[PDB]
Amino acid sequence: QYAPQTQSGRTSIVHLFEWRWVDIALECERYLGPKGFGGVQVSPPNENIVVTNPSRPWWERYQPVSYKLCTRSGNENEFRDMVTRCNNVGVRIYVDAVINHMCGSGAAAGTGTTCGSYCNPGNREFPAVPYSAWDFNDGKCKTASGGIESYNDPYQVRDCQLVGLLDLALEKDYVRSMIADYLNKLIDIGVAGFRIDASKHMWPGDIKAVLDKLHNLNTNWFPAGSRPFIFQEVIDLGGEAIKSSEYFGNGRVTEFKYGAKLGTVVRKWSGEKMSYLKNWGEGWGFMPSDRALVFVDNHDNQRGHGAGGSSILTFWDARLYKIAVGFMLAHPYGFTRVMSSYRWARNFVNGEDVNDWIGPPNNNGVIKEVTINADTTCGNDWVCEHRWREIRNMVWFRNVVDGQPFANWWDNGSNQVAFGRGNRGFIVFNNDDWQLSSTLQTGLPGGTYCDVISGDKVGNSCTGIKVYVSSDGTAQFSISNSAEDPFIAIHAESKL
Numbered sequence: 473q474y475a476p477q478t479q480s481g482r483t484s485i486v487h488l489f490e491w492r493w494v495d496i497a498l499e500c501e502r503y504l505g506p507k508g509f510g511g512v513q514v515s516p517p518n519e520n521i522v523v524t525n526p527s528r529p530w531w532e533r534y535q536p537v538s539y540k541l542c543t544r545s546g547n548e549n550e551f552r553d554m555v556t557r558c559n560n561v562g563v564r565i566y567v568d569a570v571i572n573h574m575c576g577s578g579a580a581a582g583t584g585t586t587c588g589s590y591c592n593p594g595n596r597e598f599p600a601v602p603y604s605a606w607d608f609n610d611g612k613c614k615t616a617s618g619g620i621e622s623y624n625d626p627y628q629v630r631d632c633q634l635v636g637l638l639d640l641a642l643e644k645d646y647v648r649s650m651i652a653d654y655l656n657k658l659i660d661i662g663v664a665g666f667r668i669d670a671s672k673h674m675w676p677g678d679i680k681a682v683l684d685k686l687h688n689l690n691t692n693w694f695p696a697g698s699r700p701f702i703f704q705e706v707i708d709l710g711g712e713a714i715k716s717s718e719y720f721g722n723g724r725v726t727e728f729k730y731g732a733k734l735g736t737v738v739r740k741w742s743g744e745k746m747s748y749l750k751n752w753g754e755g756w757g758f759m760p761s762d763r764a765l766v767f768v769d770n771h772d773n774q775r776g777h778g779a780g781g782s783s784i785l786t787f788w789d790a791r792l793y794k795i796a797v798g799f800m801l802a803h804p805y806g807f808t809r810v811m812s813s814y815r816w817a818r819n820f821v822n823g824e825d826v827n828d829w830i831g832p833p834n835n836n837g838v839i840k841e842v843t844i845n846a847d848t849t850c851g852n853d854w855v856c857e858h859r860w861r862e863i864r865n866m867v868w869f870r871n872v873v874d875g876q877p878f879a880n881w882w883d884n885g886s887n888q889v890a891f892g893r894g895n896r897g898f899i900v901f902n903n904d905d906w907q908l909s910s911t912l913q914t915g916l917p918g919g920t921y922c923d924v925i926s927g928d929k930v931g932n933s934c935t936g937i938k939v940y941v942s943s944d945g946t947a948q949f950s951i952s953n954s955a956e957d958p959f960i961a962i963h964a965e966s967k968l
């Protein structure tokens with residue numbers, strides 16, 4: 473596991489989705505380390521099938537063909553180099569572990585794979601592992617199609633093929649052990665933990681049996697006796713047969729209710745208002761905070777027919793997105809993951825993006841480097857949300873207020889709200905269609921604080937808005953509904 477195993481006082485990770493290992497290594501050194509980020513979720517580092525139709529989609533990386541560390545992100549040398557260099561500046565690496573399945577059961581036999589390993593999907597042959605037909609669930613699945621036909625039946629969901637993907641027999645010790653050997657190699661290299669991909673589609677007990685095999689973390693960088701951080705991808709928005717809570721014994725779980733509900737609120741859809749967020753967290757029926765991995769969007773649902781559908785806020789909706797991410801990073805609930813994306817050409821037919829397959833920025837299938845511009849944005853159509861001032865400064869906010877309680881909530885009964893974290897930070901939102909102008913109790917020591925949304929503290933100056941806090945802890949906040957960023961945030965370390 474439940475402990476993130478970030479360096480003490482670093483409280484977020486970022487998904488550097490489809491980034492190459494060498495770019496992540498550099499990003500750790502030049503940015504993530506200095507700016508107090510806890511760690512990086514990386515794309516699946518194990519060999520996957522090449523998909524040519526369409527041309528190299530992002531989702532080809534969720535069709536394993538071996539556990540060789542050999543992908544469009546880089547080779548094993550490059551992967552090791554990244555883990556080392558990131559750990560050495562206090563930034564952890566968490567691996568997206570794709571362990572429920574191998575590649576599509578309909579895929580062709582051959583060496584069209586990211587490391588050139590052979591496989592024969594039709595005959596269930598993966599000699600680079602090795603797996604054979606004995607190692608898959610084909611006989612155990614009881615549906616006529618061999619696929620998942622109803623999510624109301626937990627057995628189907630776990631024992632049958634998810635969109636045609638060959639389903640590993642996770643009951644078998646052979647298979648559990650093959651997966652563990654992969655994960656343990658990663659741990660010994662210096663990885664801090666794992667996203668368990670497609671956890672809904674495995675039995676909690678099978679996952680447990682894999683996790684029980686795992687090494688303690690590498691003592692070059694971690695305290696003796698450290699267990700790998702585990703967060704399991706389970707989409708459970710409530711009202712379905714399989715529940716998040718089934719997986720609490722194994723580690724944390726993705727709380728997909730979080731972004732779905734928050735997006736709907738901040739969009740002001742379905743009658744929802746920001747003032748309703750006063751009891752955000754368990755009060756909204758979420759899992760326990762100490763079980764939750766939270767996020768506004770992830771790599772799936774930012775394309776807009778995942779968990780949350782069109783309510784999910786993304787970099788495409790930058791203004792409201794920064795508000796949602798700001799609220800998340802200020803609020804004590806959950807352990808926070810920040811998304812970092814690339815741009816693609818969206819093309820909505822009947823409200824589905826038929827271009828939602830498009831893979832990372834590339835020249836002829838070779839992933840582009842991340843270039844850094846003078847203003848600290850990225851080129852090559854990497855969006856780099858994690859470098860937006862409004863987000864990076866809120867990542868720092870969360871560090872600064874770590875451990876401080878939810879306090880001093882205020883709202884106007886509509887869509888203006890505020891709250892603080894003990895005596896170490898305070899944040900104020902206007903999401904109404906009129907002016908915010910109020911004097912609020914911040915819980916903070918009197919003084920002058922730089923707003924870290926509009927600017928930064930530089931020496932003994934602020935580059936943006938300044939907040940003068942009275943002796944009694946109150947301050948005026950004045951925020952127009954036409955402000956570019958209609959929220960203000962201050963904390964102990966932005967005080968002059």
Ligand SMILES: OC[C@H]1O[C@H](O[C@H]2[C@H](O)[C@@H](O)[C@@H](O[C@H]3[C@H](O)[C@@H](O)[C@@H](O)O[C@@H]3CO)O[C@@H]2CO)[C@H](O)[C@@H](O)[C@@H]1O
Binds near residue numbers: 772
């Ligand atoms: O040939 C099998 C199958 O391949 C394609 O399905 C892909 C999905 O379109 C795509 O959403 C993706 O799904 C995964 C997620 O990123 C991960 O979080 C987790 O939620 O599980 C999914 C699997 O690990 O990847 C699949 C597989 O590539 C294609 O669209 C299908 O038509 C085809 O049947």
Ligand SMILES: OC[C@H]1O[C@H](O[C@H]2[C@H](O)[C@@H](O)[C@@H](O[C@H]3[C@H](O)[C@@H](O)[C@H](O)O[C@@H]3CO)O[C@@H]2CO)[C@H](O)[C@@H](O)[C@@H]1O
Binds near residue numbers: 733744747751755757
């Ligand atoms: O606690 C379990 C439920 O938590 C969440 O419910 C939200 C509602 O979605 C949200 O509308 C809001 O409810 C307010 C309601 O709209 C209004 O008519 C009433 O007067 O005040 C309510 C409280 O502000 O807040 C609740 C949480 O308090 C979650 O969305 C839901 O699925 C859970 O069942």
Ligand SMILES: OC[C@H]1O[C@H](O[C@H]2[C@H](O)[C@@H](O)[C@H](O)O[C@@H]2CO)[C@H](O)[C@@H](O)[C@@H]1O
Binds near residue numbers: 847849860
């Ligand atoms: O720190 C870099 C810049 O971050 C923000 O710029 C964002 C902007 O907020 C967002 O709406 C847009 O979609 O992306 C840009 C970055 O490309 C700050 O607003 C800028 O002042 C910073 O320079």
Ligand SMILES: OC[C@H]1O[C@@H](O)[C@H](O)[C@@H](O)[C@@H]1O
Binds near residue numbers: 643675676677678
């Ligand atoms: O320990 C988890 C177990 O749960 C059972 O209900 C399933 O039938 C097994 O396949 C699985 O191994």
Ligand SMILES: [Ca+2]
Binds near residue numbers: 572629631632639674
């Ligand atoms: Ca399964």
Ligand SMILES: [Cl-]
Binds near residue numbers: 675677678
């Ligand atoms: Cl189980």
Ligand SMILES: [Cl-]
Binds near residue numbers: 705726770
């Ligand atoms: Cl996820």
